[PDB]
Structure formats: structure tokens, C-alpha cells
Ligand binder design. Structure first.
Ligand SMILES: Nc1ncnc2c1ncn2[C@@H]1O[C@H](COP(=O)(O)OP(=O)(O)OP(=O)(O)O)[C@@H](O)[C@H]1O
Lengths: 380, 239, 97, 230, 47, 209, 97, 248
């Protein structure tokens, strides 16, 4: 029995790599009777390894959700609370990979009700973190902050394994980074997450490393990005991903949109994960507004071509629309200043007489309406 | 705190013993400093001897006292108190031969001397004794051993130790010297001890002022170095 | 304290469970309590409250909603506030006697 | 007038001098004791004030009997006096009953010694707190004797500076079905939380009381546990 | 004080008068004399 | 004719023209304490409407207690620098004269200044306002200090509700920490300042460097 | 400028810090001139430590001095050296670099 | 003023140090006893419960002193350990001299004379311990007793000493019935009194310690009820409260 368990682990590892996903799924169905024969407490950890082995094999989400549900039914038949709670937590993480619109939220909500009643706090903190990640995916930031805050408060009382503390710290960084009110605190959480991830979770550390570098570019201190990669702590994970952040920081220091664009074009893989850099390009088009002011000042100097579109930084004629988006709302405060040769950018719309009279005349005529009532009633 | 246990050996808010802490200060009231240095095969005690008036015998005024043939001590503190401790240490060392059939280990003399001091702190009707004792002896299977005891009853083994007014600075010089990896031979240990007093006091003392007592693996007996021998080391370190 | 100078010596007791509910209702008058809130349970959850503490539970609970940017107060918010207003002090090895 | 004597009652509550003694125990090097399923593990922070002090001289964890060991938080001179008396009472029991003293009984006898000092007079109470351990009766036993003379049993406990932080750490990580080796790791970790510096084989002294006896771990052994995490 | 129909005087203040450099009998003798001027009067003391 | 109003809190309102000059950004790493103190003190003045909408009556007094050097006063001065209110920090002892129960003189000035501009905020530190030469209980001595606690408690009660005179206290003293001062309605919010740990230290080190 | 403090403490304990600020402004007038806090403890009679009749007003002035020295009143490279062995107690916070 | 020495007597003939010690007993776990026809019982509140503390020691506030006697201690912990040993010593010393178990009143009078002596002699402080005695003797049958730090003692059908003693005494005086205690009824009275005196809600088994002394087959059989026995009594009290609901 014990010898079979180690043999099954050896067979499962082979099925995870050399073996087909269907063969690994067949082994899980085969070991369901074996799970009954072995002690339930040992069986639950064995199930975690088997599910992880299925994840190691080529992803088959239709089979993976079905196998997880079958395992949930076996746990329901055995009525083992620990296995069912853990199975739901793996399934919500599997749902997060498919980014289920509400299915990830639904399973988590059901598990939360059981877990708040249950004394297994460590499972509760993990599920709370999953809810914050899914709310961030759906763009509901306030609920995501609430799930993160609840996870932290439960975690503070209980002992935290290193992976849990690091995952909790990175999520604090993602929510703090998303708010955009403070990026300095977000960097501190990401570094704490990378420091925890070092050695214990090698794949996770690079993701925190990329985020802490992004924070430096976002904090308007691009020079530090190169220094952090140079540091011995970051040297182990240094790679193409580190280079992409370095070039983007250089582009922001150069204050050149073309340099930022070239970096975006060079590393497609790095571009997919983070869209905050796209917001930096929008600040950079606003950074070139001063050059547009000199281009708008070009009529005051020498107007050439358009002075609002073809002339600005030469480049594409699709530059127009960035100006149009600026013209709506606050901006240069000049409507289509392309024709003139002298430049007419100014706004003077607050004359007190128009506003004060318009308010008083409406208020004064209210006396006229009221006076009519007072006089008419006495008259008749 | 102050104004609480100032007049008695009783506990104070924050659990501080004022009368015993004042005793450590009285050792400094002596106005003299002592340094002791352990070595690969040697233990050296050095003290400053001040002859206040020419009409006083240099031989009579000694703060280096042999307790047993293989054990010697340097006493820093009030003179009367230091001598009383010396008689007790000699009696206990003698009893150890008398009741156990072997010579007192240096570690054991300290525990006995410290235990007498601790009882004075716990039970009233006794002044703690304003003196600190550093004991040097060679122990087979332990090498040369330097040990120190406090009025409170604290005892500890020290690679190098100091006591008196300049103890804090003296330990600081010793800390730099001890940090150096090289072990110290008899010449080096005599030199380190004399230099430690020299750097701390800046006296550049003549042979008469420094009193040096040394115990060695080759000669286990505690030996009080003669003035001529003391001068020979003092000239050599200057070079 | 002599009766001629002071005729009556009225005593104000710590609010009873019924009284705590009454004070809770008085201070929850303007709050937008969501349907399903149990004010009676909240009075039971805090025993021997100082009345001002019952007022405190409402103010802290409202702030939990304000930080969450919602005007809809919920049963959980009152329960969390009860804990925040409540204060507990203990020491160890001084448990002689 | 109260708080200056242990021979007089407080005019309401309790004698303050015993409480002041507890304050001295609180100002002590951290001591962590972890009872475990197969043994009791005791530990203390031994940091010399200067590099000169020898770490091989006076020892904080000291054996009292083959199966009984003691650790202390509080004034160091007072500990040696009770370490001797506790050892002697264990010997008197052996001569009278030809059996090693049971751990529970030794704690009661040691506590009576501590109470005598708290009695009226010039004598001042011991400023040390103790963590007796034993394997008597096939069951691991961990006990604490305070200066007052009260004795209590702890699954895990801490005394000295940051006792509260240690106790809260113990609440979070101490289970019950843990082997002594796992208990050794937890004991070292609690000291690390309150350790103002990098723990080294010399810095921490750890003593175990398994079903074989109380043996202070060798400096090399402490280093191996300090290494490889913990 | 809101539902009174009587003068309400609040004297929760401490001693700044009497024999200090301040004034004489202000806390008590003066407070009662003012209460005499308004016959229906209630005085609230908070110490 | 009537002259314009004369006199001002301390030297002048908001600690005169002497703004502390420590920005909230300069105080880096006290994130939880910064948010709580802001809600208790700065937010009621800036957005009273939000508090009225939930009808919660804004929390007023805040108690900040921590091991020394943990960043409570740098935050307290920072609140004065970032405040739009007449935040005369009014540490307990400064322009105050010899007096018995001098808690009224300080609070009375705050009410007038809060009315003149915006609800004023008081920080309790330099709490040696009393212990004056014209002071001493008849025989108890301690009673006179107790009299100060009572006088402060009477003023704190409920102060100008909407123009609340917010009171921030950072005294690590149990003697003035009576349950009555800790009662809700007096020190409504309590924030404890932890010794900078890892991450909080990294923030303090990065900002200073 | 000698800060004996006898002139600085006249009829108001609080005014002592304000008068020191006036002296600091006088010190600012000459960049070479250096403030010397000689005999800082020295005062009429004896320095008043915390006490029922008189508290440690001088200690409060020392804390006020620390605030004046850094930030609000530092210009002209004038050094307010506390070169005095007169004070019985030295503040640990003052000792900080 | 007239404090400090137990020896000084106040101008009103009052020994304040003895009075202070008697007041001090209040800061201690509740201990109560009921005489109970056909039995006797001692109930105590187990204060200072914590997850880490083992509670390996059998009992904690209940100590047997003889084959036919027992006591519950409320007071300074160290003083209690001193008194319990002396009470055990006096019991065996009487057996050695007369070969009969000590009559219960005598064991109480002897400790009380020792406690009384501490008050009359200058050097020592008055004992801070008060205790309740349960036992059976042939001369006067089942008895219950109380001792004070002053050294005064009394026999009570029911009494309480620690914590809210007055609340228990008021509840006991109304609920107790003379001659009708019937042990099981007395156990119920204790659980109900304990619920009122303890601020603890639900009176969990760990918080309560119950020791019952009965004479079975001519031999006293002092027994401390196990947690399971205590739990059933607690559930019965809770069920009785449920029966009281609506009717009340
Ligand atoms: N968040 C922070 N960022 C940067 N420096 C800080 C921060 N918090 C504290 N410091 C530094 O620590 C110093 C000590 O702060 P502060 O004196 O306000 O501490 P405190 O605990 O409030 O003590 P006190 O109440 O005595 O003023 C500050 O003056 C500043 O130099």
C-alpha cells in the first residue's frame, strides 16, 4: 500500500511528462479506489500532487474542470471536509486561468461561506486573495481592495507560509499600483514579494521584479531601473525581460515617444502583461505638448506646413486625434490653430457681468412671480 | 526609581537594585585600573601602582595577591574590601584541597567568591564590598584561564578583561587587539597588557609604576615579575 | 452629599441589553441600515457597553462604509465596529491571587 | 509606605515588591520553552556584551538531574543559587526514595525555596523565573516557577524581553503532534523574532529533554539547526 | 437645559478666582446672586 | 465705530504663518496611520457632506500611541502643513500663562479661530501646560493634576459639533489615559504606531537617502 | 552671545523660548557670531526640575530649543553650540546626531 | 496612618492589615459549597485559562487533606501552598497520635490558630488565603466550613468566598432548602449560582471545577467530577433555562 503510493507518485510524474494527459486522467480515476484504501489525511495531499501533475501535463481545461468536479463528487461521497475545501480552491485558480466571468467568483463565494465557519484559516486567506485577483480582472477595484484587506487581516493572526506572505504582498502591490494614488508603496510590496519569492518560488520572482522596475519608470525616476537590475539580488533573474524595462526607462529619461514606441515594438511578450506603460505613452504625448506649443508658436516664429499636424515632430499625420482628444476637455485651449501664421491660443470666458446678471434676473423675476400672488389676492 | 531603593538592598520599580549598582561605582573610586590578558600558553595581570609619598614602602603597596601556588589575583577597589576577599578566596581554595583532595580550578574559585557576594545582595545587614577580582591560573585541559567577578556576584570567563576607572576604554583597545587573528605569546601578552594601560592612561610609565604578575604553562606558579624584568619588557615594546 | 444640600442621588447604570438596543436605535436613526440588519443581536454582542460605546459602534461602522465609498451600512460593518470600539487588556504571570 | 516592604499588605490589592521582582524577570534575555509530543526543548539568547567574554564559561541552560533541566530569565547571580538548591533537593529525594525526583515534585520543592525569600524580613525575593523540563513517567513535562512561588505548566511559553511577541508567535505556530526536532526549529525561530542581531552557534544555547535525559546541545549541533533555515 | 422654561447656568469650571490673583467669591457667591436675579434657575456643576 | 477683531491663537492661527513644511509624501511608510488620522481630522473639514450622507457624525478625537521615534508627530506636523483648516497645532504648553485647569483657555481660542475660518485642529504634546507656579492641591498635590484631567474632559465632551475642534493626542502616559479619556465621544479613534519593520524601514531609508 | 538664560527667563516661563528665538534672530544678524549656551542651567536661585511648586520649564525650553535649532530657525551658518557642562541632565534625544 | 504592622491597633480597635487581607480574598476564583443531605460539594472557577497552559496537574483549587476531608483555596498562591501542606500535616499527626481521622472542626481550628498567630506577631503579614472545608466526621456528620485570613472560621450550609461572593450568597440563600438538598439538586444549585457569579457566558466545562464528597459503604469517597460529568450538568442547566423560556 505505502510502496504502491510511492510507485503511483513515480507513475504520476512520468504521466505528467512522458505520459499523455488522458493517461494521467485515467490514473486519477484508477487511484480513486486506492484513495479509499489509504488514510484520508494522506490521500488529500496525494490528490494535491495528482492535480498539480495534471496541470504539469499539456493543459486540457475541459478535462481538468471535469476531473476536478469528479474529484469534488468523490470528496462529497467520502464527506471529507478538508479535501472538498481544497478542491474548490484549485478549481477557482483553474477558473482564473480561463478568467471565468462569474464562475471563479461563484465558487469562491460558496467556499468563503464554508471557510468562515471552518477553522482552516490558511485556506481562507488563499481564497480571499483569489477573489481580489478576479475582481481586478473584472475591473471592480473597490471590491478587489476589500478582498485584499480581508485576506491581510485573517493572515495577520495566523502563521503565514513564505509563498502565502509573498502572494499577499504582491497583491497589495497590484491594488496599490492600480489606484495610482501612490506607486512608492506599491514598489515596497513588490520587492518584499520578490524577496520572499527568491529561491522558494523562482518563476514568481521575475513577475515581481518586472513590476518593481515598472514602478521606478512610473515614479518618474527611470535612472534607478538600471541600478536595480545591476544589483546582485536581481542578477539571477536578469534576462530579455529585464532589458525591456531598461530600454523603456531610458526612453522616459530621453522623454522621446519614438524611443518608447521602439521599446514597445522590440519586446512584444513584455508588452502583453502590463498596460500601465501605455498610460506613460499618453503622458509622453502630453509631454510633447510643449513642442506643439513651439510648433503652435511656429506662426509667431515661422508657420510651416500645418503647424498643428504635419509640422509637429514631422512623423505620421495620424498625430491629429491626440490633439483632438486634448481639444475636448482641458488642453492647449486653442481650437484648430493650424491656419493663421501668427497663432491665436487664448481663453477669456468668465465675464462677471454675464453670470451675476443672469443669476440675479432669474432670482429677481421670482419676486415678480411672488409679488403677483401678494397683490392679486388682495385685489381679488 | 531613585529615592526608592537608594537606602536599602530592595527591589525598585523596573526591578533595579540601586545599592548593588552603586557598588560597581566604588571600584572606580579606587582611582586605579587593571588589565588581564589570556594567551596561547600564558595569563598576564598588569596594574598601575601609585606610590603617593616617597616615605611609603613599594613592597607593602601591592594589588597583586597570590591566592594559591598556581592561582593569583589582581584586586581593583577599596583596599580593605579587596584584602577581605583575598582571605576568603585563600580559605576557599585551601578548603577545596582539604575537602576534595585537589587544587581549586580557577573557574571554581570564582563561583565560590561570586556566591558569597550574591548572598550579601539577597540578605540585608551587609555592604556588598567595593572591589572586583580578576583571577589567573593554568587549568589542565582548559589552558591558561582568566576569570573576573563583580560586587553583584556576576562571574564570567574573559579572553581579556579590565577593571577600574579606565575599564571601558581599556576593553575597547583590547577588542581591536583580540579581533586580530594572531594568538599572543608570553612576550606579546605582556606587551598587549602594558600597551593597553599605556594607550588608556598615556602615562608611558617607568618600570616602578606597572606591577605585572604572570602564570605560564611551563611555570604554573603565579610569579610577581621583578622591577628589572618589568623594565626589560617595557623597553622592548618601545623598541 | 448631605441630604439637605443634595436631596437626591440618582444613579446612572451601564445600559441593560434592552437599553443598549434603545440607544442603538437612537444613534442609527439617520444611518441607511440595509434590510436584514439585526440591531437586537448587535446590542447582545456588546455586553456591559458604556452607551457612548454603542454610539461609537455606529460611528465606526459608518466609517467602514465611507472608506468603501458606500452609504449602505451592513450587519457585518456593525459587528466589526463592535470589536474596534471594544478594548481588552491583559498581563502575564501577574495572574497570582 | 507600601511598595517598600513584602511584610506588609497593599492597602487594597497585593504586595508590590513581588510585582517589582517580576519586572526584573521581564528585563531578561529571551527564554523559549516548547513542550513537544516526544520531548521538551528549552532555549535562551546568550549574547556576550563584548567579543572578549568567553562563550564557553557560565552556561544559561544547566542540568539539575539526569532527566531534569532548568533555563532562566532574570538576574543571573540569583539563578546559580537556585540551580544549586534545585540540584540538591533532587539528590535528597534520591537518597530518601531511591528514585530520580519526578519533574512535577521538583518544581513544587523549588517553588517552596523561592517562596521562603518572599517571606517577611530583609531578604529580597529571587529576580529569576525558571523553566524546569522533564521526561518523568514517560510524559514530557514543562513547568514555570515564578519569584512569588506560584508554579504553572506551559505547552509553550516565553519569558524575558518581548515575552508577548514570543507568546503570540507560539500561539500561531505551535501545534501538538510535533516531534522534538520540529520543536527545536520553532524554539529557535521564536528567539529569532526577539533576537537583536544574527543568531550564531555561540549566540543561542539550546537544551533538549527527550526520553534519555536533559542534554545541552553541542555548539556544533546548535549551528546545524541555526543553518538550513530556523 | 433645552426643555427647561427656567434660566440654566453651567458652572463646570475650576477655581481661577477666590484668593488667586483673579477675583473674589466669583465661583460661588456671584453665581448664586446671578441665579437670584433670574428666579426660575437651574445650575449644573460637572466636578 | 467697531474695530476689526483683535488677538490670535498662539502667535497666530495655524501656528501663525509658520507652516510645519513636512509634506505627507515626506512622511513615507505610515500608510495605515496616515489614512486613519486623515479621516478623523482632515476629511471632516474637507467633505462634511459624505459624513452627513451616512449620518455618522464625523469621528473627532484621535489618540496616537507608539514607541518613541515611530512617526506620529512628523505626521502630526504634516497634517498642519497639508491642512486648509486653522490647524493651530497648539501643543499643550507654549503661549499659555500660569493657570489652574488651563484646558479652557486653549479650547476657547480654538472655537473662535475655527468659527473665523474652518474647524481648527489641536495636537496635544508638550503637555506641561499646567504644573504652574500658581498651582498645588491643598494637601494631595496629585489632585491638582487630576483637576486638569477633569477640566480637559469637560471641554472635550462635544465641541461645536459641525465646526468640531478636532483634538489629536500623542501622550504615552497611563495616568492621563483614564478610561474616560479613552471613551468614545472623547478620543474616538486610537492608532498605535509600530516600530518600523522591514518594508516600512525600506520606505523610510529610501526617502531619507 | 552668552545664553546664561537668567535674562531669558524673566517673568514668564513660556516667554523664555520666545526670548531665545529673539536672541537667535540677533545671532542670525551676524553670520560669524556663534550662540554659546554657557551656564544654561544657571538661573535665579536654582534650576527648577519637575516639581509640584515649579516643573521642568527649562527642560521644555530645551525641547523648544531643539525645534528652534533645526528647521524654523537655521540660517547664516550660525552654530547654536550647547557648550555647557552646567546642565545636570543631558536629553538623550538631544544627543542624537 | 495605623497601617503597616499587623501589631498596631487603630484608635477604633481595628487591625487594618488583617482587614486589608480579608478584603483581598475578593480578587480570586469563585469557590462555593453546599452542605447537601447525603453528600457535600465544592465548586470553583478555573480562572486564567489559556491555550498553551497544560492543566496536567489533577485539580488546581481543590485539594484533599485526608481520606475523609478536602478544601478549596482562594487567596495568594504561595500562602495557599504553605497552608495546604500544614493542613495535610495536622491531619496525619492526629491520626498518628489517636489512630482516628481528625474531626473536621478540629482541623479547621488548628489552621485557624496558626493563621491567628501571624496577626498577633509583628514580623509576619496576615495570611491572604481563605478556604472552604468539606468532610464527614462521626461526631457531627457531614459539615462545611469557612476560614478567614483573620483566623476566624464558621460552619455554613452554603457559602462562597472568591470574586462575587455576595451575589452567590444572595442566590444561595433564596434557592437553598434546609434538609432537601439531595446532592443532585445541590449540584444544580451550584451550576446556576456559578452562571450568575461568573461573567463567563455558557459556563463552559473548562471554566468550572466541581468536587463532591460522599460516604459510600462506610468510606468517604471524595471525587472530582471529570469534564464529561461536568458537561452533562451544564447541558441540563441550559435545557432548564429553555424550559423556563416563554413561561418567564
Ligand atoms: N514616515 C517617515 N518618513 C521619514 N522619516 C520619518 C518617518 N517617520 C519618522 N521619521 C523620522 O523619524 C523622526 C522621529 O519622528 P517623531 O519625532 O515624530 O517620532 P514620534 O514617535 O512621533 O516621537 P515624538 O512624539 O517624541 O515626536 C522624524 O523626525 C523623521 O526624521
Amino acid at each position: 500500500v505505502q510502496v504502491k503510493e510511492q510507485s503511483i507518485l513515480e507513475l504520476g510524474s512520468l504521466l505528467a511528462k512522458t505520459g499523455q494527459a488522458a493517461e494521467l486522467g485515467g490514473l486519477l480515476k484508477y487511484v480513486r479506489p486506492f484513495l479509499n484504501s489509504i488514510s484520508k489525511a494522506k490521500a488529500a495531499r496525494l490528490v494535491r500532487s495528482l492535480l498539480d501533475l495534471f496541470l504539469d501535463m499539456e493543459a486540457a481545461t475541459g478535462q481538468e474542470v471535469e476531473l476536478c468536479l469528479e474529484c469534488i463528487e468523490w470528496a462529497k461521497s467520502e464527506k471529507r471536509t478538508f479535501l472538498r475545501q481544497a478542491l474548490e480552491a484549485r478549481l477557482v485558480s483553474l477558473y482564473f486561468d480561463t478568467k471565468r466571468y462569474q464562475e471563479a467568483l461563484h465558487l469562491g463565494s460558496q467556499l468563503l461561506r464554508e471557510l468562515k465557519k471552518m477553522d482552516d484559516k490558511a485556506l481562507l486567506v488563499e481564497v480571499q486573495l483569489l477573489e481580489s485577483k478576479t475582481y481586478h480582472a473584472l475591473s471592480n477595484l473597490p471590491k478587489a481592495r476589500a478582498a485584499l484587506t480581508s485576506a491581510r487581516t485573517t493572515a495577520n493572526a495566523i502563521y503565514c507560509p513564505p509563498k502565502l506572505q509573498a502572494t499577499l504582498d504582491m497583491q497589495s502591490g497590484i491594488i496599490h499600483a492600480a489606484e495610482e494614488k501612490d506607486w512608492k508603496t506599491a514598489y515596497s510590496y513588490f520587492y518584499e514579494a520578490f524577496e520572499g519569492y527568491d529561491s522558494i518560488d523562482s518563476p514568481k520572482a521575475i513577475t515581481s521584479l518586472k513590476y518593481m522596475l515598472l514602478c521606478k519608470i512610473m515614479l518618474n525616476t527611470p535612472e534607478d531601473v538600471q541600478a536595480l537590475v545591476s544589483g546582485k539580488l536581481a542578477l539571477r533573474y536578469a534576462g530579455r525581460q529585464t532589458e525591456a524595462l531598461k530600454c523603456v526607462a531610458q526612453a522616459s529619461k530621453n522623454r522621446s515617444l519614438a524611443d518608447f514606441e521602439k521599446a514597445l515594438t522590440d519586446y512584444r511578450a513584455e508588452l502583453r502583461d502590463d498596460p500601465i506603460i501605455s498610460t506613460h505613452l499618453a503622458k509622453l504625448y502630453d509631454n510633447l505638448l510643449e513642442q506643439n506649443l513651439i510648433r503652435v508658436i511656429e506662426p509667431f516664429s515661422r508657420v510651416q506646413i500645418e503647424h498643428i499636424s504635419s509640422l509637429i515632430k514631422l512623423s505620421k499625420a495620424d498625430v491629429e486625434r491626440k490633439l483632438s482628444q486634448m481639444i475636448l476637455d482641458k488642453k492647449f485651449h486653442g481650437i484648430l490653430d493650424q491656419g493663421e501664421g501668427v497663432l491665436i491660443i487664448f481663453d477669456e470666458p468668465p465675464v462677471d457681468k454675464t453670470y451675476e446678471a443672469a443669476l440675479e434676473t432669474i432670482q429677481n423675476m421670482s419676486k415678480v412671480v411672488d409679488s403677483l400672488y401678494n397683490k392679486a389676492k388682495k385685489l381679488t | 526609581s531613585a529615592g526608592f531603593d537608594r537606602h536599602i538592598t530592595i527591589f525598585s520599580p523596573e526591578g533595579r537594585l540601586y545599592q548593588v549598582e552603586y557598588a560597581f561605582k566604588a571600584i572606580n573610586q579606587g582611582g586605579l585600573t587593571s588589565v588581564a590578558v589570556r594567551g596561547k600558553d600564558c595569563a598576564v595581570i598588569v596594574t598601575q601602582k601609585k606610590v603617593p609619598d616617597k616615605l611609603l614602602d613599594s613592597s607593602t603597596v601591592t594589588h597583586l595577591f597570590k591566592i594559591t601556588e598556581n592561582i593569583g589575583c589582581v584586586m581593583t577597589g577599596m583596599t580593605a574590601d579587596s584584602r577581605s576577599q583575598v582571605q576568603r578566596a585563600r580559605y576557599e581554595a585551601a578548603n577545596w584541597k582539604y575537602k576534595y583532595g585537589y587544587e581549586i580550578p580557577v573557574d571554581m574559585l570564582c563561583k565560590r567568591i561570586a556566591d558569597i557576594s550574591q548572598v550579601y545582595t539577597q540578605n540585608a545587614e551587609m555592604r556588598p564590598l567595593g572591589c572586583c577580582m580578576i583571577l589567573i591560573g593554568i587549568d589542565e585541559e582548559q589552558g591558561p584561564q582568566v576569570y573576573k567577578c563583580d560586587p553583584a556576584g556576576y562571574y564570567c570567563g574573559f579572553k581579556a578583561t579590565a577593571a577600574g576607572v579606565k575599564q571601558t576604554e581599556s576593553t575597547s583597545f583590547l577588542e581591536k587587539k583580540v579581533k586580530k587573528k594572531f594568538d599572543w605569546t608570553f612576550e606579546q601578552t605582556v606587551e598587549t597588557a602594558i600597551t593597553c594601560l599605556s594607550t588608556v592612561l598615556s602615562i608611558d610609565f617607568k618600570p616602578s609604576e606597572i606591577e605585572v604578575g604572570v602564570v605560564t604553562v611551563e611555570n604554573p606558579k603565579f610569579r610577581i615579575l621583578t622591577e628589572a624584568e618589568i623594565d626589560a619588557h617595557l623597553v622592548a615594546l618601545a623598541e | 452629599l448631605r441630604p439637605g444640600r443634595i436631596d437626591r442621588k440618582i444613579e446612572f447604570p451601564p445600559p441593560n441589553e434592552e437599553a443598549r438596543l434603545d440607544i442603538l436605535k437612537i444613534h442609527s436613526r439617520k444611518m441607511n441600515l440595509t434590510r436584514g440588519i439585526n440591531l437586537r443581536k448587535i446590542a447582545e454582542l456588546m455586553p456591559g457597553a458604556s452607551g457612548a460605546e454603542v454610539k461609537g459602534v455606529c460611528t465606526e461602522a459608518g466609517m467602514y462604509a465611507l472608506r468603501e465609498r458606500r452609504v449602505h451600512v451592513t450587519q457585518e460593518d456593525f459587528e466589526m465596529a463592535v470589536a474596534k470600539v471594544m478594548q481588552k487588556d491583559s498581563e502575564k504571570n501577574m495572574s497570582i491571587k | 509606605g507600601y511598595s517598600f516592604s513584602l511584610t506588609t499588605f497593599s492597602p487594597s490589592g497585593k504586595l508590590v515588591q513581588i510585582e517589582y521582582a517580576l519586572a526584573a524577570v521581564a528585563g531578561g534575555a529571551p527564554s523559549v520553552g516548547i513542550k513537544a509530543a516526544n520531548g521538551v526543548v528549552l532555549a535562551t539568547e546568550k549574547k556576550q556584551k563584548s567579543i572578549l567574554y568567553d562563550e564557553r564559561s557560565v552556561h544559561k541552560v544547566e542540568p539539575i538531574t539526569k532527566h531534569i533541566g532548568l533555563v532562566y530569565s532574570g538576574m543571573g547571580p540569583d539563578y546559580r543559587v537556585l540551580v544549586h538548591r534545585a540540584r540538591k533537593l533532587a539528590q535528597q529525594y534520591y537518597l530518601v526514595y531511591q528514585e530520580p525526583i519526578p519533574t512535577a515534585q521538583l518544581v513544587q520543592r523549588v517553588a517552596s525555596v523561592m517562596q521562603e525569600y518572599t517571606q517577611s524580613g530583609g531578604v529580597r525575593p529571587f529576580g529569576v523565573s525558571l523553566l524546569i523540563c522533564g521526561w518523568n513517567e514517560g510524559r514530557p513535562y514543562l513547568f514555570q516557577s515564578d519569584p512569588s512561588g506560584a508554579y504553572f505548566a506551559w505547552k509553550a511559553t516565553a519569558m524575558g524581553k518581548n515575552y508577548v511577541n514570543g507568546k503570540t508567535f507560539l500561539e500561531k505556530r505551535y501545534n501538538e503532534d510535533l516531534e522534538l526536532e520540529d520543536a527545536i526549529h520553532t524554539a529557535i525561530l521564536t528567539l529569532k523574532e526577539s533576537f537583536e542581531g544574527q543568531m550564531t552557534e555561540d549566540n543561542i544555547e539550546v537544551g533538549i529533554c527527550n526520553e534519555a535525559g536533559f542534554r545541552r546541545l553541542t555548539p556544533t549541533e546548535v549551528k546545524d539547526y541555526l543553518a538550513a533555515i530556523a | 437645559a433645552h426643555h427647561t422654561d427656567c434660566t440654566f447656568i453651567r458652572v463646570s469650571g475650576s477655581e481661577l478666582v477666590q484668593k488667586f490673583i483673579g477675583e473674589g467669591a466669583r465661583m460661588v457667591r456671584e453665581l448664586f446672586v446671578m441665579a437670584r436675579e433670574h428666579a426660575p434657575s437651574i445650575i449644573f456643576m460637572d466636578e | 465705530d467697531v474695530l476689526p477683531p483683535e488677538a490670535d491663537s498662539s502667535i497666530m492661527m495655524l501656528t501663525s504663518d509658520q507652516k510645519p513644511d513636512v509634506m505627507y509624501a515626506d512622511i513615507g511608510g505610515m500608510d495605515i496611520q496616515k489614512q486613519e488620522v486623515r479621516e478623523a481630522v482632515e476629511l471632516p473639514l474637507t467633505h462634511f457632506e459624505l459624513y452627513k450622507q451616512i449620518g455618522i457624525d464625523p469621528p473627532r478625537g484621535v489618540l496616537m500611541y507608539g514607541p518613541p521615534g515611530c512617526g506620529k508627530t512628523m505626521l502630526a506636523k504634516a497634517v498642519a502643513h497639508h491642512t486648509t483648516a486653522a490647524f493651530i497645532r497648539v501643543v499643550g504648553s507654549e503661549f499659555v500663562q500660569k493657570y489652574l485647569g488651563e484646558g479652557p483657555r486653549m479650547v476657547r481660542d480654538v472655537f473662535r479661530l475655527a468659527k473665523e475660518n474652518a474647524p481648527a485642529i489641536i495636537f496635544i504634546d508638550e503637555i506641561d501646560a499646567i504644573a504652574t507656579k500658581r498651582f498645588d492641591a491643598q494637601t494631595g498635590a496629585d489632585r491638582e493634576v487630576q483637576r486638569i484631567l477633569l477640566e480637559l474632559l469637560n471641554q472635550m465632551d462635544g465641541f461645536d459639533q459641525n465646526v468640531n475642534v478636532k483634538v489629536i493626542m500623542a501622550t504615552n502616559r497611563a495616568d492621563t489615559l483614564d478610561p474616560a479619556l479613552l471613551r468614545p465621544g472623547r478620543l474616538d479613534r486610537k492608532i498605535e504606531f509600530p516600530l518600523p519593520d522591514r518594508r516600512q524601514k525600506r520606505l523610510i531609508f529610501s526617502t531619507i537617502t | 552671545l552668552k545664553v546664561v538664560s537668567s535674562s531669558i527667563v524673566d517673568k514668564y516661563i513660556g516667554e523664555s523660548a520666545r526670548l531665545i528665538r529673539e536672541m537667535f534672530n540677533y545671532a542670525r544678524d551676524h553670520q560669524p557670531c556663534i550662540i554659546f549656551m554657557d551656564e544654561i542651567d544657571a538661573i535665579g536661585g536654582r534650576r527648577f526640575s519637575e516639581g509640584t511648586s515649579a516643573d521642568r520649564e527649562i527642560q521644555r525650553t530645551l525641547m523648544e530649543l531643539l525645534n528652534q535649532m533645526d528647521g524654523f530657525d537655521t540660517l547664516h551658518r550660525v552654530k547654536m553650540i550647547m557648550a555647557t557642562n552646567r546642565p545636570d541632565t543631558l536629553d538623550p534625544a538631544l544627543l542624537r546626531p | 496612618r495605623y497601617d503597616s504592622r499587623t501589631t498596631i491597633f487603630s484608635p477604633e480597635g481595628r487591625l487594618y492589615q488583617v482587614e486589608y487581607a480579608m478584603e483581598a480574598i475578593g480578587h480570586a476564583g469563585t469557590c462555593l459549597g453546599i452542605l447537601a443531605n447525603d453528600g457535600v460539594l465544592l465548586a470553583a472557577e478555573r480562572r486564567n485559562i489559556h491555550k498553551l497552559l497544560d492543566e496536567v496537574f489533577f485539580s488546581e483549587k481543590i485539594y484533599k487533606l485526608n481520606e475523609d476531608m478536602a478544601c478549596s483555596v482562594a487567596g495568594i498562591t504561595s500562602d495557599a501552598n504553605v497552608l495546604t501542606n500544614e493542613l495535610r500535616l495536622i491531619a496525619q499527626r492526629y491520626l498518628l497520635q489517636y489512630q482516628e481521622p481528625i474531626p473536621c472542626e478540629q482541623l479547621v481550628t488548628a489552621l485557624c490558630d496558626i493563621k491567628q498567630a501571624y496577626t498577633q506577631f509583628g514580623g509576619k503579614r496576615p495570611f491572604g488565603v481563605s478556604l472552604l472545608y468539606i468532610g464527614w466526621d462521626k461526631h457531627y456528620g457531614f459539615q462545611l466550613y469557612q476560614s478567614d485570613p483573620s483566623g476566624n472560621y464558621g460552619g455554613w450550609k452554603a457559602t462562597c468566598i472568591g470574586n462575587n461572593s455576595a451575589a452567590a450568597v444572595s442566590m444561595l440563600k433564596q434557592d437553598y432548602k434546609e434538609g432537601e438538598m439531595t446532592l443532585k439538586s445541590a449540584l444544580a444549585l451550584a451550576i446556576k449560582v456559578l452562571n450568575k457569579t461568573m461573567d463567563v457566558s455558557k459556563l463552559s466545562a473548562e471554566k468550572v471545577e466541581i468536587a463532591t464528597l460522599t460516604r459510600e459503604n462506610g468510606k468517604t469517597v471524595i471525587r472530582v467530577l471529570k469534564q464529561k460529568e461536568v458537561e452533562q450538568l451544564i447541558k441540563k442547566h441550559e435545557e432548564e433555562e429553555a424550559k423556563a423560556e416563554r413561561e418567564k
